[PDB]
Design a protein around this nucleic acid. Sequence first.
RNA 1: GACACCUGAUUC
DNA 2: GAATCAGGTGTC
Lengths: 133, 133
Amino acid sequence: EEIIWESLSVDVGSQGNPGIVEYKGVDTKTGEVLFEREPIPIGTNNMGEFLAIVHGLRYLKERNSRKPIYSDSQTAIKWVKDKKAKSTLVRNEETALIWKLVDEAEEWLNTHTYETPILKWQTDKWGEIKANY
Amino acid sequence: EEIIWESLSVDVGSQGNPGIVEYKGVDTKTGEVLFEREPIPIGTNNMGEFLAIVHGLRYLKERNSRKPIYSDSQTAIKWVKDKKAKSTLVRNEETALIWKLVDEAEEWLNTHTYETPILKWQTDKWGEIKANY
RNA sequence: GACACCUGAUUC
DNA sequence: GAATCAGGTGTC
Ligand SMILES: [Mg+2]
Ligand SMILES: [Mg+2]
Ligand SMILES: [Mg+2]
Ligand SMILES: [Mg+2]
């Protein structure tokens, strides 16, 4: 109910859905961009939302940080929880790159450990998420 | 598409949104101003766009004119089509006047008949609408 | 129902 | 940068 400022905020950005997807992670307190993914040709909002959290996880683990992660995506939070992204995006030559990243994400989620709390950003109370595009 | 010069062009003009709104109708061919609404204290762009078309309709009917009407407003064209303006503007003492006009507009749209074609001005091909402020 | 992502047309 | 509307997609 109270914003935990000592945290990382992620968000996806896109042009079309499915369409070009990118995502980044910033410091919730300052908004400093800590990581940003190079635009992927084709992917869904949710896939991008998902990859943003997994990426955030790896990023905190590499810096031995116990800060939680904020995502406004109800779908991605669950996918991360079950360590399983359940996307409908067709698998083919076009969407080959996003699916690569996605499979890798899940692989990492199963070959690694973390205690990082994954929090739901309450847009309906606090406004847009800090990493919002 | 070919521009139908034998027609009426309407547009809204405002200061803030919501804010002070006004609108006028001109001859598409010459730009002659055929009617102009006295500035309303508070209203939205779309409400002003909507009122501009309905006013245009009454204006053509009174002169027994079958000329079509041009509006660049996707929202207003649909509102006129359903004879129902779906605005979010709060209803209260401040916005009392604009809502009056709007209610009256819809009332007129239901107590009257017309064949007047309502055309979408293709700004992305022809430039600004002739009644543009 | 809910959480998101845009797309488009406008208004400043 | 910020507000007003309509349409369409990805998911729980
Ligand atoms: Mg998001
Ligand atoms: Mg966002
Ligand atoms: Mg207009
Ligand atoms: Mg204009």
